[PDB]
């Protein structure tokens, strides 16, 4: 029952049109709570979940400045990778940064992680030990060299078991009412025949939290790893999630197939069938 | 909370 905070950063260029777009979003476990868009009217870091709103103007002042800081070391980097990669200055490009921290059930530091990408390609990532870096090509290999000099490895290690892990706890307490809840998936099955000799069994599940869930279609003990249709768990729009799985079944054998839902908020795996 | 001191470029 561990918890995590993740900060998602994305920078996309627009040659000529104007300064590139910077969308930064933050996620505590699986709930979004802060937001920053270079294009919104505010020009300031914004709240999204209610329990962070209680923090005062000082929190919004620092947080706006430090995220405006990251926006800028990234405009520069958009162009710098334009150079390293020998790419035209007429094309739009995407840098994606992701980093975050893990705390255990009891508040301890577990692990921290940073991963960066260019145009959807793995670029550099922070290693296991938090003391080394890994470059994906010889172009990022030059960045790896520079960070090894100004010691971005150790001063970022300081952050991931310090400033993040504290404020993660504070985030888990200022909203423990709403971040610690475990909502169980409300399960039911539906049936729609496709032809005479054929029919479809689809096992649905709504309103669960967190999104980790497992729907497994088992025919008399057998996994339909080669016969089942599963969709991406999707957000309902309200802080809970939805996911469904379906299997193609011969018309008249809807009892041989069984569905199993295994979730954190479900006491024991439910096995539902026709 | 966001990282406190943004560092070196790439």
């Amino acid at each position, epitope marked *: 029952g561990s918890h995590s905070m993740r900060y998602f950063f994305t920078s996309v260029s627009r040659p000529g049109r104007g300064e590139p777009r910077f969308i930064a979003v933050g996620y505590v476990d699986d709930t979004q709570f802060v937001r920053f868009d270079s294009d919104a009217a505010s020009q300031r870091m914004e709240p999204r979940a209610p329990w962070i709103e209680q923090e005062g103007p*000082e929190y919004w002042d620092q947080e706006t*400045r430090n995220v405006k800081a990251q926006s*800028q*070391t990234d405009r*520069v980097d958009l162009g710098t990778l334009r150079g390293y990669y020998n790419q035209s200055e007429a094309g739009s490009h995407t840098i994606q940064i992701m980093y975050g921290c893990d705390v255990g059930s009891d508040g301890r530091f577990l692990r921290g992680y940073r991963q960066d990408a260019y145009d959807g390609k793995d670029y550099i990532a922070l290693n296991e030990d938090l003391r080394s870096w890994t470059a994906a090509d010889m172009a990022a290999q030059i960045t790896k060299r520079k960070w090894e*000099a*100004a010691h971005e490895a150790e001063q970022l290690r300081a952050y991931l078991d310090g400033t993040c892990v504290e404020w993660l706890r504070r985030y888990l307490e200022n909203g423990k009412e709403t971040l610690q809840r475990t909502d169980p998936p409300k399960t039911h099955m539906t049936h729609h025949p496709i032809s005479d000799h054929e029919a479809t069994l689809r096992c649905w599940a709504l309103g669960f939290y967190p999104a980790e869930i497992t729907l497994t279609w088992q025919r008399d003990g057998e996994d339909q790893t080669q016969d089942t249709e599963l969709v991406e768990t999707r957000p309902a729009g309200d802080g809970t999630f939805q996911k469904w799985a379906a299997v193609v079944v011969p018309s008249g054998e809807e009892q041989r197939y069984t569905c199993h839902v295994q979730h954190e908020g479900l006491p024991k795996p439910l096995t539902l069938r026709w | 909370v966001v990282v406190g*001191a943004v560092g070196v*470029g790439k």
Partner: T-cell receptor
Amino acid sequence: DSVTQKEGLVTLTEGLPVMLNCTYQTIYSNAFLFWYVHYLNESPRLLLKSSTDNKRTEHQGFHATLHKSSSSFHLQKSSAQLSDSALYYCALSEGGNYKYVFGAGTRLKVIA
Amino acid sequence: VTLLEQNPRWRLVPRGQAVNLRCILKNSQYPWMSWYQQDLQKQLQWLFTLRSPGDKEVKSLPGADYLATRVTDTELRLQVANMSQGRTLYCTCSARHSAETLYFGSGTRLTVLD
């Protein structure tokens, strides 16, 4: 407000211990304080820094210790020498800010 | 021969005139550059911090108008206009945008006279 070095000018004989007063005002946890020294016909350079409560930091015979409790970071030296005569600026980084805030300067004029 | 290189080193300015200063970064891994002013009272004060090429901002203080531009990662420029009080201006860089040691250039002394 913010940083305040109340004593503007300090005059003592060489051999007397030296102390400069520096008080500060932040609303943030991110308290990083600096002493910078600026001689005449030189540039300002760093003398010492810390952000750690009650950690003595020393560098070149000068030392200061941060006391977050009293919003203080006083600069100390055991024995004044003719060579220390300078302008001294104390300055603080409020973490949230991109800028740095300096005091009005304390002139230590050691005489013989 | 140093980490920051600032020009011009000194400039006599008739009142109301302009002077352009520029600073050259000598080590790309301290990219956080800033301009500070020092007034005739010996007080130090921050002016701008700009990271990306293309950044321009203006600011007016007692005695001088400022226009700042980061040309590239290593060339930063500063225009002082409509002066009425002498100054010293310093260029700086540091490894992180705040909470790090701030490193000072040699400085440009400006004097207002006829």
